[PDB]
Amino acid sequence: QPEPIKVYGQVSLNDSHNQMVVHWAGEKSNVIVALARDSLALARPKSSDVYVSYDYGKSFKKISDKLNFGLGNRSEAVIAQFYHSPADNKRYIFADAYAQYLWITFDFCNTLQGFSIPFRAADLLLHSKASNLLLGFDRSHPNKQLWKSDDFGQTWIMIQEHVKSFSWGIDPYDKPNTIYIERHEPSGYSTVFRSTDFFQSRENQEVILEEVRDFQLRDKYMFATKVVHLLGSEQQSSVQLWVSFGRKPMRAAQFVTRHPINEYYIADASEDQVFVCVSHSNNRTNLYISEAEGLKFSLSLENVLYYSPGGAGSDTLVRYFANEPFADFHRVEGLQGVYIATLINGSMNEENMRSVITFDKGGTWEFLQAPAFTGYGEKINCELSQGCSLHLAQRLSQLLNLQLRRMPILSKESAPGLIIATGSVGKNLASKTNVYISSSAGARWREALPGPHYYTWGDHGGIITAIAQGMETNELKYSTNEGETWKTFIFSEKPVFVYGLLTEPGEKSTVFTIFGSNKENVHSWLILQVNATDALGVPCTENDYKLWSPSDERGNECLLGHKTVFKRRTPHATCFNGEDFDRPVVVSNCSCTREDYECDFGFKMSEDLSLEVCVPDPEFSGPPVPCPSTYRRTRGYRKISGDTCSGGDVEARLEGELVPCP
């Protein structure tokens, strides 16, 4: 045995700040940057240290002293946050918690330069394409002023006052230099502006929507919440959700509803479709799904577990950890139609939560089929029809039980189809927790490991690592076969407290980073670096790959008449894809099905549920101008929005009928 895992580096920081912020610069940079800072929660932060490595975590160099007020200030610098550039991974900016002072770098932190600035950098926002460009916001200013810098933060100009929030636009839907803002109004509410010239000209400033509560920007979509007084002052206000797709003017979305809607939360926005959580004034929250490219919302799932500081869960522990509403709702990343939600039955505690899953973007929902056998091999008695299934914990479930270290469901585009989650088998989420794994995008699970663990993967999903939570340890569990079997590696001589287990975003490496502190002493930071190439041993070859689409799990059914096929390494293959693996993905249209069509405007389903066609609706009694070209008139059946279906017999007949121009 030449040990299958090397400990490429051991690093004691001699630092005991309660929080660490880490950034890998990536792009094969080999640079990692860390900030040790006091807890954010307090607004009284007292000290900070900054460390950077250049040999990919083999050894960290402390640079806190290089952050100073120039020659010579005995005042001691203290950093709140540091900001990186999406555009240039070499650049970095550090901001003093107190001093209206900034530090910048274009050399991965070798050389830092100090500057004072006309405001405190509470919050900065760096353009994602233009490295030189960024914005800076001073929340604590009475006027809540907003500033732009054009030279990566040396010189600033203040371009707006009374800002509630702001963001850059998005390529390519918005022009370059587009900035969105909510600006405060004397009513409770705010006005939403767009500007292409940094609010310099009035003709380049554009009103998007007036009197809004919140506003949000998300790819093709923009969302806002409006409180309208319909009956008048004396009457019930109505709360509405306004929506723009493709930057058309925002219009109010239509909701079919028993009850008064109290607030909205955008849970996910993808493929021209939107999941919104509508919560009512009774603390119930249901989940709607947008038509494709549309404002036509229909009910998808009821009683989703949800927190809002205004609303539900407000009066529990969660409030001490979340100051912004969210839901235990998960998008399985890199896939189109697969989501996992926590439902709530009674009051908020484990006993009342159950997990459900969808593969059709919320068309239908099922409970999660529990694994047949334990990790060890013994039969697990669990029957869906006895109300028994698999249930997976998510931040909210967890935050209620005050479990701040547990793992949210893990899924990433590095490994399409692979989910790892903390959960339980039973009637609900309230039993012993284990680690569960699927590579069928949720369709089937295995009990991978018995206890709570930290887990992560590398090499595009080909190797998984895990460390047992709760007590000190020096074991690193790992698996190369999607958790079917595990092997332990001792990562240090004496066991230590583990704070987390990570890989450079992208999960391409076979390197893992363990953060922790040793047992003997009270907390001090400590970082190990670990190379697990030899566990995979050899390069993969065409033999180790196989093709897979989610359709393969839901009986070949496409989604909006298209499907994605992925080249994935088989589960048993012991070999490594390689950091540069460039995973073949193919999207394609599939020949048409009945489910690709719906009933046309003013048509409906005949009473005989058994056999289902569209028939002219009686109550509507029932034309293109100008026609010179061919009309193709309806047979009562219409391809559903966004559905890219193509080919097949059912298309051949069920499609609309032509009539050559009038």
Partner: peptide, 11 residues
């Protein structure tokens, strides 16, 4: 394992 020390954030 201490409840309010040793917390980690990726950027």
């Amino acid at each position: 394992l201490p409840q309010d020390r040793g917390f980690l954030v990726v950027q």
